Every structure is written in C-alpha cells, then in structure tokens.
Amino acid sequence: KDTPFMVQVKLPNYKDYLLDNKQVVLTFKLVHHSKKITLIGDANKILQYKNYFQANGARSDIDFYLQPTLNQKGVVMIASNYNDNPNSKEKPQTFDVLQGSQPMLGANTKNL
Amino acid sequence: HGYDVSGANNKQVINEVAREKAQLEKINQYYKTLLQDKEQEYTTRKNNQREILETL
Amino acid sequence: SNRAGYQMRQNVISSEIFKNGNLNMQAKEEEVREKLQEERENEY
C-alpha cells in the first residue's frame, strides 16, 4: 500500500463471468492495495467493472477514473498507488536499472 | 460488502455521448462536397444557386 | 534514339491540345456541381 505502481491489466470479454479463476487473485491484489485506478473500454462494461470491484473488494477512496471508448474489444484497467504516507517515503532513483523493470509500466519480458 | 451504486453513471453516459459527438463531427468533417472556399468560377455559381434556389 | 523518340513523340494521338478536351469535362463538372448545390440548398 506504500510501494508505488501503475500496473496495467487487460480484461477480456467472456460470457457473464467477467474474470478468471486463473487470474483473479493477481488482479484483485492490485485493486485492493491501489489508490487510483482507471478503466478504458466500453461504457456499461467499465460501469459494471467499477460496480464489481467496489462491491467485491475495493474501498471507498479509490476515485475510479473512467474514460470510455467505442472500438475496444475488451477493457483495460490501470491501477496506480501513490504513496501519500508521511514518514519518509522516497522513490528509489527512478529505477535506471537493467535488472529490474521500472514500476510504472512493467513491460514484463520473462520466461526465465 | 455493500451495494451502494447509483447516480455516478449519468456523467459517464455524458462522456460516452461526448465521444459520440466527436466521432460525428469527424464523420461530418470527412466531406468533399460541401462548403470549402474555391475559386471565383466555383463560388459565383455557388452563390447564384443559393440565391435562385431560395427564390425557388 | 533521338530519331526514334522524334517518330514516337509526335503521334497523331498525342502531343496536342487536350485543353479543350478536359475543358469540356471541367464545364460538365461545374454544371453537375451546380445542380448538386441546387438539390442541396433547396433543403439546406
């Protein structure tokens, strides 16, 4: 809840189940621990995803940012976590690092 | 954990209709036939068709 | 090569006045644009 991220999760368009038990805990950890998430896609789809997240596991200060589109097969979400804790809470060198991926948009390239 | 969902959707529908309005303006801007300022041989014929046609 | 170019370049079908030939096309273009705006701002 203090480590910053702006991780982007795609969301496909199944029949009536709207997530995956393959991918449910990984995409709920970010919405539980995030602070500002945004939703890009179809109008009623991002509406019911805001409803589903707020009714299932979110909290009352996320400030869901919705920007709807038209030609978007699927719906993509971006979960961000500003720190906003008053102790020290500084960013480590904006991660100019070849080992790690920078924690704004991961661009995960891995099998090994 | 609490349903609590109403009223925050008309703003979103306003956003959808604003993107719809932008798409309609783009579609309307895709034209080759309507008003576009041309040479005098085109434009005098144009103004004459407007005038004779308002009389018609 | 310039002699063959001279025999080919001045054909009876080419290298002449197409200015009237496309001027009539331009005139009928202006006239169908005229009738197009007629049928347009009859109701615009």
Numbering used by the authors:
A (entry chain C): 57 to 168
B (entry chain B): 169 to 224
C (entry chain C): 225 to 268
Publication passage describing the model:
The H. pylori Cag T4SS is of particular interest because of its role in translocating CagA (a bacterial oncoprotein) into host cells, an important step in gastric cancer pathogenesis. The structure can be divided into three major regions: the OMCC, a periplasmic ring complex (PRC), and a central stalk. The OMCC has a structural organization markedly different from that of T4SS OMCCs in other species, and there is an unexpected symmetry mismatch between the 14-fold-symmetric OMCC and a contiguous 17-fold-symmetric PRC.
Adjacent to CagX, we traced a continuous chain 243 residues long corresponding to CagT. A predicted lipidation site within the N-terminal tail of CagT was not observed in the cryo-EM map, but the N-terminus of CagT is positioned for this interaction with the outer membrane. Using symmetry, focused refinement, and symmetry expansion, we determined a 3.7 Å resolution map of the OMCC and a 3.5 Å map of the PRC.
